[PDB]
């Protein structure tokens, strides 16, 4: 339609793709740490109360 | 695209002209002309084709 936002290659890559990957990387690190703590209960000591 | 018209690719802005030229050939059964043939027999065959059509080599 007439309201569709059309971006060139450079503009699209710079203003859409890269921030998306940046947010994805942040999510990756945060999820790794929070999941490891969620299961084992310790950030670096494996199972809690066991070792 | 239609056969013999001037067409324009407006993605690229290029003017082109398709054209179909039919492959009318003598029946390949060994009775092919071994030397330059004149327009008479060819005239008859072309007339018949243009009026009623000729089989396909399938």
């Amino acid at each position: 339609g007439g309201d569709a936002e059309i971006l060139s290659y450079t503009e699209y890559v710079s203003t859409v793709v890269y921030p998306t990957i940046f947010y994805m990387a942040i999510t990756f690190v945060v999820s790794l740490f929070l999941m490891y703590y969620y299961i084992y209960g310790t950030f670096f000591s494996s199972t809690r109360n066991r070792f | 695209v239609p056969p013999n018209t001037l067409a324009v690719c407006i993605d690229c802005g290029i003017h082109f002209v398709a054209r179909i030229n039919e492959q009318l050939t003598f029946w390949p059964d060994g009775t092919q002309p071994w030397e330059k043939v004149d327009f008479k027999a060819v005239e008859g065959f072309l007339y018949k084709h243009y009026k009623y059509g000729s089989p396909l080599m399938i």
């Binding site: - | 029946w27 018949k48 009026k51 009623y52 059509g53 089989p55 396909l56 399938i58």
Partner: protein, 151 residues
């Protein structure tokens, strides 16, 4: 569509169509001609769509039957063959789906009920009594049915 035989005979090598007065169908096994009609894939659909019509009309019995056979034909043939060869399986299925068969259910008892959350966990389950007999539709459970003894 309509035959092209006049053109084929008046064409350019009519000797190729002499076979067409033998026991021979035009569409399948005759040399195609420069001026032949264009044959489509589903001729019924091809002829009906440009007129706005779907190929089959349910009001015509022949069309209704043809479409039923196309869509539901082999399905019902397989079902009928299975029911003929395994009458007891469908009998048991009908018994179970109609609440006629109860394995070892009693009267007035409560039974465990749990939807998800992994295997049976006593901290999540409920216990349910049969609403059918709470209302009164059920008073005793039939015993004439087949019973999986030794289970």
């Amino acid at each position: 569509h309509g035959s092209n035989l006049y053109n084929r005979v008046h064409g350019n090598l009519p000797q190729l169509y002499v076979e067409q007065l033998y026991n021979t169908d035009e569409i399948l096994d005759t040399v195609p001609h420069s001026s032949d009609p264009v044959h489509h894939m589903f001729p019924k659909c091809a002829a009906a769509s440009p007129l706005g019509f779907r190929p089959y009309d349910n009001n015509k019995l022949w069309d209704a039957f043809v479409l039923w056979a196309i869509v539901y034909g082999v399905t019902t043939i397989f079902c009928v063959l299975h029911i003929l060869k395994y009458p007891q399986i469908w009998k048991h299925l009908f018994e179970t789906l109609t609440f006629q068969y109860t394995y070892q259910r009693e009267i007035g008892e409560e039974y465990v009920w749990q939807y998800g959350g992994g295997g049976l966990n006593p901290a999540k389950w409920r216990f349910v009594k049969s609403p059918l007999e709470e209302l009164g539709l059920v008073t005793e459970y039939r015993s004439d049915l087949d019973y999986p003894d030794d289970l």
